[PDB]
Write a protein that binds this ligand. Structure first.
Ligand SMILES: [Mn+2]
Ligand SMILES: [Mn+2]
Lengths: 372, 372
RNA sequence: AAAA
């Protein structure tokens, strides 16, 4: 353990996780990691998130998290001298991006003009630069996987990338099946949310719509949700009426748009790696679960969350869109750090001032039907 | 001007606005304020927001905003030296709280151990400490008004703390009129959202409920909303049925709870000054306006936003509570700064696990019916 | 407390 990595622990874990893995990628030496943290951050389990994201091996690296006062500059510098008494280390690498300005400046005054030390700073959205001894800039490109990102936030997640239909079908599914049958799709939405149908698919995996009683379809109490209309729209999308699973119904009522968005990202977006894209994702931190439609990590390590609303047209759509904007911004601002971009994708045309102004102030990128 | 105040401009304007007004309050000298900013912040109008909150006499203080690279440490140092060559200033005061770490440590190294300079740092939520020349701590208590807080964020707002009823009435309004008439209030809620009733109040200020025909009351299509039931509940609250205003209906359908929360804060809360309490305020930044029920600034200068939901009972209530939590978190995390506490007040008893877990993860303090 |  002849190389030590000194990092300051604060709310944003990415600057530390990104930096540490990068040094691991360039210099594959075994190291000891010194995380300078505080009582406040250790209560939020921040240094632990740093460990689990990189999930090194006990042999390869040693982690030590030491405590200091985040606001006493002289205490942070004094704790550093006591630790580096008659130092045996051959390479001292210091990343002053984390912590408070007090914590960073305190560590900086101790390590500046030190004989065996490299000092780095990571400006957000820019390439990592070292400040001492030589002023240099390094590219932080493709350094992090998606799993490493969410692990740094203490997030557990599951996803299902299985699509009911393939990319070639999803490129034309709107023009061929959706546009001319939106009233029939509204009937299936009523079917999907009907008390009986939602509970029977808890009991059976497939369902034969031909052998379903007719009374069950009228109990839905929606004009479009007739037995003939529902069987017809199932056939329009190319499903086997004898073997209908809940996944197929979810596809018709808008699940197609999520798969269209998901596959478009995997196949057309070149600044994102296909392996870092997830569909129908569910996150959990502190036993709080949220479902995000499509999330991905681009080559620049910025996280992108997309809320997919197939159609939000009509005035009852503006009520749905405003809730989607609030829901999206609430989730992303609380669960994720500062390096995220919010998106709302829709096939309907958003031409009303209030959602557009709300989105611009929230920072939510909208990709309208005009841009799809 | 013989005193200069150097501040770094960044996302958070409160630490600069707080500090500058404090030094003005302590020394009362005419001074020049040098705002060290960047291209990125001047696009967000940050230095403009800072000046505006203070609004000092043009004669008594002069502002100069100079630009730098937030990530170039040597460039920020050079702009400082060129500016202070043969400086005429007797007192140079430096507040390194703003800006990036690069900007902060650069400003620190330029002024550290230089004569006629005081260096300050403002840790969030603690007393302001100066680091040079003498280590000292100062109290930032009752330093900021509510108006100064919202002005520092570029927010336009209007409010009238006018209540339909007074504190003496709003204490006990629940026990005397609301608790035993919850079904009658639901009819009035249905009445408030009826197309006819909401539109006539667009044209007329008073309404005579005695000459409204019953056919208008059954068009509401709510079991409780009979003409006698609505006349009954209006008189229970003490309103004149011959001339009922929109304020009176809005009061019954939960507006009473906003006034109760507002007045309780003004009369019972020990850490907040009544002049820093606002009711039914509507904010606007960019071109997006939202309405907040009760917001106030406590004597510690932390802003408190309250979402008042009178009742969230039943399955139809959880959807309102779930939406209120997203909406609250979305606004305060996007429109306000780092030093805010979010609250949701309700008369109902919240025991459901998921909303409590959501609120705790969002950081939303909930005060249910247990704590009136 | 990657621009309290
Ligand atoms: Mn969806
Ligand atoms: Mn409300």
């Amino acid at each position: 353990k002849e190389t030590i990595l000194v990092n300051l622990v604060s709310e944003q874990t990415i600057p530390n996780v990104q930096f540490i893995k990068w040094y691991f990628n360039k210099k594959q030496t075994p190291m000891k990691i010194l995380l300078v943290s505080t009582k406040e951050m250790e209560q939020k389990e921040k240094s632990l998130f740093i460990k689990n994201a990189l999930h090194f091996s006990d042999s390869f690296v040693e982690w030590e998290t030491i405590h200091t006062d985040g606001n006493d500059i002289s205490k942070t510098e004094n704790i550093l001298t006591d630790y580096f008494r008659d130092n045996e280390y051959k390479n001292i690498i210091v990343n002053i991006t984390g912590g408070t300005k007090i914590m960073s400046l305190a560590a900086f005054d101790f390590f500046n003009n030190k004989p065996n030390t490299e000092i780095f700073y990571q400006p957000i959205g820019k390439e990592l630069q070292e400040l001492y001894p030589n002023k240099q800039k390094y590219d932080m490109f493709e350094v992090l996987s998606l799993k490493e990102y969410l692990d740094a936030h203490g997030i557990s997640y599951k996803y299902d990338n299985e699509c009911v239909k393939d990319w070639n079908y999803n490129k034309t599914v709107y023009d061929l099946c959706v546009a001319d049958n939106r009233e029939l799709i509204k009937g299936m939405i009523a079917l999907q949310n009907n008390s009986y149908f939602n509970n029977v698919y808890k009991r059976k995996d497939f369902l034969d719509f031909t052998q379903i009683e007719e009374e069950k379809f009228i109990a839905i109490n929606h004009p479009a949700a007739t037995k003939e209309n529902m069987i017809k729209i199932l056939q329009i999308f190319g499903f086997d009426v004898s073997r209908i699973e809940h996944k197929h119904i979810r596809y018709i009522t808008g699940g197609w748009f999520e798969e269209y968005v998901y596959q478009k990202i995997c196949n057309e977006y070149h600044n994102v790696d296909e392996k870092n894209v997830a569909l129908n994702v569910t996150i959990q931190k502190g036993n709080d679960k949220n479902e995000l439609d499509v999330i991905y990590l681009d080559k620049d390590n910025k996280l992108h969350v997309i809320e997919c609303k197939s159609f939000v047209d009509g005035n009852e759509g503006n009520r749905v869109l405003n809730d989607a904007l609030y829901k999206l911004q609430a989730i992303i601002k609380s669960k994720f750090g500062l390096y995220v971009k919010q998106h709302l994708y829709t096939k309907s045309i958003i031409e009303k001032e209030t959602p557009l102004n709300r989105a611009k102030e929230f920072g939510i990128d909208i990709k309208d039907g005009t841009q799809l």
